[PDB]
Design a binder for this molecule. Sequence first.
Ligand SMILES: CCC[C@@]1(CCc2ccccc2)CC(O)=C([C@H](CC)c2cccc(NS(=O)(=O)c3ccc(C(F)(F)F)cn3)c2)C(=O)O1
Lengths: 99, 99
Amino acid sequence: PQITLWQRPIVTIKVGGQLKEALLDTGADDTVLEDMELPGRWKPRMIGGIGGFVKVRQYDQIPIEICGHKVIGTVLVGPTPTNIIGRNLMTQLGCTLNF
Amino acid sequence: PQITLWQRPIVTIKVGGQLKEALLDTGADDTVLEDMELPGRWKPRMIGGIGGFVKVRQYDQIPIEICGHKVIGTVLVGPTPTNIIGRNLMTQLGCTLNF
Ligand SMILES: CCC[C@@]1(CCc2ccccc2)CC(O)=C([C@H](CC)c2cccc(NS(=O)(=O)c3ccc(C(F)(F)F)cn3)c2)C(=O)O1
């Protein structure tokens, strides 16, 4: 699709069988999700946002459907104002910024 | 332009007579710049993101030139770790996400 920015660019994602809303965020290097159960082992990571740093759990090679497109990549789980889709997964979508 | 997302989408801006680099962030409601002087009255605000909340000064109707295009909007200033251009200005550039 083509998504304008007059409202938050929120899309429906499917992760671990669950439908969720997530924000397409070109300012985010990584994908950060609200607390949920994910399979496999996790590794520690610290990420920086406008408010400072947060400790997150890093899970690798997690499949997510974003608007019906299947992507598979790293997801970080921790305290966040909302589910955030970052550039790591937007590049798998072939997503670009256009003006 | 069409900007891919393999790297951070960073652009040159001119604001309050200062030239700076800033990150195009589709996930940010608002534009938030590192602490600086801007003309006019301001109001204090607390804005939330990853890492928590940041105290900012809100300036209204500030002209910013982004990649040569003049836009006008509210500009927040405070101790953000990076200059961020939010949706409030990206819309004025006609910027869309496409996949
Ligand atoms: C995953 C980290 C993401 C990011 C990284 C910033 C960065 C980049 C390079 C180097 C250092 C730091 C980008 C980002 O959009 C935000 C948040 C939204 C998730 C953000 C950015 C700008 C302003 C705000 N405050 S706000 O009032 O405009 C706002 C509040 C909430 C949301 C919501 F959609 F996320 F809920 C969006 N905007 C928040 C952030 O806090 O850090």
